[PDB]
Amino acid sequence: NKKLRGALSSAILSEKPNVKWEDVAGLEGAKEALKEAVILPVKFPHLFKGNRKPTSGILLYGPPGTGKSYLAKAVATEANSTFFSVSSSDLVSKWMGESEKLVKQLFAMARENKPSIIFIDEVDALTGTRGEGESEASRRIKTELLVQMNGVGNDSQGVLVLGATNIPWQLDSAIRRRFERRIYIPLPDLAARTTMFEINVGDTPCVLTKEDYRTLGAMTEGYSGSDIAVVVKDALMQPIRKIQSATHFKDVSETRKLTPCSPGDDGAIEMSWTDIEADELKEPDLTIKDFLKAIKSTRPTVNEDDLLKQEQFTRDFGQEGN
Amino acid sequence: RGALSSAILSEKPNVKWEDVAGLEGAKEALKEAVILPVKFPHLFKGNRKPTSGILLYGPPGTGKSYLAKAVATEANSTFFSVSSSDLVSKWMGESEKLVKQLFAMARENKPSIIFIDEVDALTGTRGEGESEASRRIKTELLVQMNGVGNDSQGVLVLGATNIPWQLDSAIRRRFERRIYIPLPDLAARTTMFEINVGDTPCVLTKEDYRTLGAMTEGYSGSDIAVVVKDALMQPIRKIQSATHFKDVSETRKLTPCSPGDDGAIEMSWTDIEADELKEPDLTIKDFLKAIKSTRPTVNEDDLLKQEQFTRDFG
Amino acid sequence: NKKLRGALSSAILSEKPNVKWEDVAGLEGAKEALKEAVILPVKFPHLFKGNRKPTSGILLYGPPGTGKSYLAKAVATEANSTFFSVSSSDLVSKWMGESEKLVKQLFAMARENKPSIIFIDEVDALTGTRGEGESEASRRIKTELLVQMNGVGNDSQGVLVLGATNIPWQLDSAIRRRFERRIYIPLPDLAARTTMFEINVGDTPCVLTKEDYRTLGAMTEGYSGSDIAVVVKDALMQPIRKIQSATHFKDVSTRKLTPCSPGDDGAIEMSWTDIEADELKEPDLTIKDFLKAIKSTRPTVNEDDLLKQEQFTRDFGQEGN
């Protein structure tokens, strides 16, 4: 009975990934819903008294790579509560009955450590609409999930069941009834893309301006957040390729701060960068040409049919996440 | 053994018969089946036998577990709210011993009532499933549901199921009373809004509740509850939109108003202490915004499958 | 935990197949990307700090038999890291809920032995777009890979997930999102074919020149690397066939026997069975044996699979030279 809690104690993370609300570019409706879900019942407990109850479940859905796990990291950072990060490897067991006793002990620990947050990434693996799947695991896990979510003699009060999935239409109808907040996280718009570029570039010394970031956001038409992250990564790795595949360096302005340039200048010394020791390194600064080359190299991942499926799911049972 | 100390609840959740909006036939059937053998014990003897099996079904989120909570509140009897988690073990034979001792304790604690939520977790139709944990448990439940001569006085089995066509036909025939819980009508919608608002101050009238129930076309009970929750949370969002606060009348009860007024004290909202914030009142516009936000959680395929099931086994 | 680690301890290869970067011909973009993402964070760790992070996953796709596993062998040789080479037999198990703990313990061992490189050959078998596959094991192993790659409470820093598949359009969209660099490995051009011929012939005694290698590389149009390897193997096997059909031997220059035309100076007419070892002299390689091997062995890949690979490249990939 204690080995179950010892196995489930590895699902409570204590690393606290530093993702703040200013790190998330856009998604103001989802951020406001998560704020009124977690920040308010701990900061202002004198408002949720009587017939006013907080939210008891939020389903984040959308295209792959839009920021659902990033909002989960931001909630785990700024929640100041117990965060349960479970998956299909922490609930399914080899024996018989342990696959439901683990879920019962997980919800018992979540109710014992209230206020607590249960984050189940990829809820479509556990809830497979119980029509054709494996009888034992599917039926028992889904029914125990329903009973531990509301049930009769459980009274789940103060816990939050976060869920992030890419396939929202393959959920069970009872699970979709349990998740009382269907929040659609879409692909980012122009202002969100420009703020995401401003966040991902950071304190790197570059000649880019706000008009340059605006033209970059206008260029990335249909990109996702991971695609913006990898074109920022490619544009940041571009000065390393510039300092690798070039010769005829030149000391600019400091203990020989030498920089690659055109062959033939005021001191175009023909040597290699491997002989250059550290801290006499003046790499070329970022321009718009490196980000244009990163845009030309890296291609968008999300197609234009899954967007139609997510749009049909929003018009069927979904809200908007701005 | 002693592991069944969590199947019975001692909380008694305060859900009375007036809280259950609508469902008059199911309410009166559960009422007679839980009251009349305790009210008039001479009425049930021999031929005129009471109901020993009650099954509830319909769309998901219509009031099955709510009716079970109402029975557990206004029954005055031992409630056995147990599911498939406390019936299956790692060993062999203990999965039958659990059901045997469960029915033994339920017969020893007469008058009792056993409520099995999601009974399809025990009825996998034994196609190619787990033998020792499916078929033997199903036959044990079939021979322990043979209390038409054994448990004439005492226990009563219940059932709540969202998907009732995937159910074993033997236990379906053993459940003699199968009541279909439908989507609520307009009067049930209006009294459900009246119950869910409750003692919260508002300006909503009976005509406002009637047009709210007319706007909710095809909504369910949980959808009505989360619409009421969103309408309750909307004045907190209006306070969070803090601009040009204004004091009303005791001991500095502030209230935000339109930008540009008489006495528009432009300040924040977190600088003020508690118990002096006169919150705005519930209009109909926040309710209409919650209606436009919240979507119905049920589809048309489940409704036609429920219609097929009730026309096949009404 | 310890049983799964004892089962997964036979996945770290300690063989180190000696394939260097000069052995691979062509594929300059794939070479440069693998070179930075393998060599640079373990050689110069002071550069990758702050906003600069290395590549966390590289996918190699193309027609069958182009050099994806050869590039993986070169990475495993020149990586100086704990090279994890898994497939669909080390992860899938018989019991219930034991295939996910295998992947979790694999990624835990990769994080415990960082810097590490995970090479999953034929990723198309594990990931099948989770549309109509076998529900429990398929969807759970896909969601377990998706959680263990980046996830929330994992923070995979230092590991690398290499992929090598022949059919990349059957990959899941989230898995294609995880593989942040799709590198297309195409059919080789004339300089790469000439370099592969010079590498595969190598130190063999032959009279072949640069013009002969250029004509061979111009002749093998549409061929692949395995086809070049087997025509070099057939051209090397042909002197043993000439030794088999070697009537009228001729000892030219400790009695090194050499076949010739029937009837010559010193035409000792015998067979090669009675001739003992450590004195044989094989005939030299000419361009005629290689032309015979080219006329004997056909190419493997056709011209519609290349169209599908180019379609996937222009839709969701980059050109890897």
Added chain:
Amino acid sequence: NKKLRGALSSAILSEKPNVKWEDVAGLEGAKEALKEAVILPVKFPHLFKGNRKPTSGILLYGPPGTGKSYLAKAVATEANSTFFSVSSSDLVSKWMGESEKLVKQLFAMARENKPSIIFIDEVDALTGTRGEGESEASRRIKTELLVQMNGVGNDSQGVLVLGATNIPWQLDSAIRRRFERRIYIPLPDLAARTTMFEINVGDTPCVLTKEDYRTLGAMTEGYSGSDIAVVVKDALMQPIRKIQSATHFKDVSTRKLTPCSPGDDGAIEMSWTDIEADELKEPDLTIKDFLKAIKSTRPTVNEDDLLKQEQFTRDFGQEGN
């Protein structure tokens, strides 16, 4: 561990069926290729040192009943090495993730006994081009085969994957790349037909000569080796039919009795049940029984699958002749 080896120990054959290389008619190129690839690394291992490596997989395709399994029996006879005869029932299992472990254990058992031969009969039943078949079985078994043949951390040196199929155009492109030599086994010609007649007549008493066998081989054009074997068996059973369907008998010259016409020298009428042992003499063979068997049994090969086999040969095939 013990279960997989106990299940795969039955795949090794030790009976050694005696079929020599002279028992196969024709197929000179296939005979030469199989002869070198099974004999030369076993007999003379000093010829393949470094740059020259033997063949690592041979596909024997063609029409059904052409001598593919007979050629595999000849290789298993004069191989002098370990022979693995696997099929679909020995690799495919009922449990989840058990067939891939069986293929891995099969190749690991074959690598411990180098040199070894793995004769996967009917590779078309285990390779279905990964297009539309069963997801788990198809993708996982084909992926385990593609990884286990060469792979990265395998180093398959000293093995040979012999494959015999009838529909080679329904194979995967990666599997066709894996099989190096795709040798065509075409229909036999006149010389192979006469050689099959000369080896199928055996040592039975007959009056047939070389020109008789040449005329028979000219008459059986459009047939195959199984058809030649069944007309030889039918012509061998025709004198037993003449024994059984006869009433008038005759003792010629310890009672070497033979049937006769009704009315002869000593036309004794009795039965073969009354005929005891060591006294029965069969009638002699002639061209009439062979012509009757040829006119009695019809061929089995059609004329469009031969065109498809010729198309696959012209696309990606060698010549066995």
Added chain:
Amino acid sequence: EKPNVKWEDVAGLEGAKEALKEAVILPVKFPHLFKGNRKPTSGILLYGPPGTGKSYLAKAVATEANSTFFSVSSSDLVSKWMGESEKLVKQLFAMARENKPSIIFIDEVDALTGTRGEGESEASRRIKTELLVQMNGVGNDSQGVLVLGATNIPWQLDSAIRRRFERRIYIPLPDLAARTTMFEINVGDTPCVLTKEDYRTLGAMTEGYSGSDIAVVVKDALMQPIRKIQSATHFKDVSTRKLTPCSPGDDGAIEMSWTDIEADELKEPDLTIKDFLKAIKSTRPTVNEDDLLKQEQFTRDFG
């Protein structure tokens, strides 16, 4: 598993009878013959229209050979699990070679596979190829084990399976003497007044039927007297109370039921020609006409 049907109980099918007789009797009775190149037949396909005594002839060979028999069917070698419908065939051939010499009877070989055209490709290919490897293979050495296959549709088989089956014997429609002999063995030991000319006219009338059709019309003509005993009134005491049914109203037509009739005294009426005429006028032929053309074509290119 041993039936009790000898050679004489099968009517007609002379070529199939002599072929099976030599192929399963010649090695087991004369071991001094099959030496050297003389090998027995290792496969026989018995096709044709259904109901024409194929399993009856298989039981005749199972009786008269005095050897071990295996009488599995198509549904026995088809499972729902993945890769379990081939280990059954492997264990079948293993237990056949364990008790050599043996006879293997496989029914509905057209329904065992699906000629890998449109059905389940994985299961079809694995079943077919495992059947072929268990038939000849490489290290399977099937000597003395006879594969006796029977089917109703031969043209939906595979080229490799029809190559593995050596002698493709056709079971045709029965003839006049076969129909009369089938009537004579189907009527049994019941008290009858039927003659050989009556059997000849019956067999001339039932041209185009099958053996199962002849069996069920003999069963109908045998059940019709005990049907007319029960479904009749106004019985007649002929000649210690021998009662016989007649028309209502006769020379002493006693109207009663069969409940008050004493045991071992009720006169059962003998069956006549009109019962068989009613049976043949009631029963219709079952076979089609294009299947005979398909059998003609199959014999025409695989005679």
Added chain:
Amino acid sequence: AILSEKPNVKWEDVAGLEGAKEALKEAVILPVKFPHLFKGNRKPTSGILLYGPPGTGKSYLAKAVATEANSTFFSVSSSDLVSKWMGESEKLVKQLFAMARENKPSIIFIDEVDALTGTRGEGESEASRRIKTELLVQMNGVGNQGVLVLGATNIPWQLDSAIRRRFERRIYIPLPDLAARTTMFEINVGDTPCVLTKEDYRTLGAMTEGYSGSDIAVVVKDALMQPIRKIQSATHFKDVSRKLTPCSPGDDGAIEMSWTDIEADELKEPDLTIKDFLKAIKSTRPTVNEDDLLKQEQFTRDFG
């Protein structure tokens, strides 16, 4: 899983079905009554299929045959065999035939032969081939006297043709008639206190054309609870004979309040009426579709 009993159901205990009983009785009872009639190649029926819409008590009729043949009744449900028992089912079908052999004269009753035999083209291996392959072998057990198999089906159209063919004799069990429905009402109320006359019973009979015994049973169970129903829930009440029974507004001595207001055991439950059942008839529709008379009669025409 296998029931066994020496039942005591006479022909007269089975309402109606006189036409079906006479043919079935002559087929089975005549053989048993006068066995000397069946020497040689004349052999009694040993398979009989009973088919017709549900709610006709095909089971009850089957027990009557057993009672009248003076045989042990052995019985099994095919639905249970196929689902509940699952694998042990082969063993069960065996043991069943084995018991019956050991206990001649005896009768095997297989109920819902349609829930077992399903044409074997798409069924699962163990239940399909094993369950449907063992029954057939056993019904060939006539050849290896003394036992009879009676199959029961509601949906004969859905009955495996192979199984179908083992049931030489087929007998249609039709829906009930006026006299029988009248008897069913009487039996179903039996001793219960009520004021129904002989004529009321006939009325109830006449008013339930197309109902089955089952239907009538459900309707009667409903009606008998009406006086309890009235006593439990009444707006106003009234003293009689002190016992307060429910009465309409402003009845003689009509005091309105609620059942809750009234003392326990002094509450008067309403008396039983013929009219009240009429209520119950309206709220229970018949079970059996009207196309059944033809579908069953098609079978009587074809295999009767």
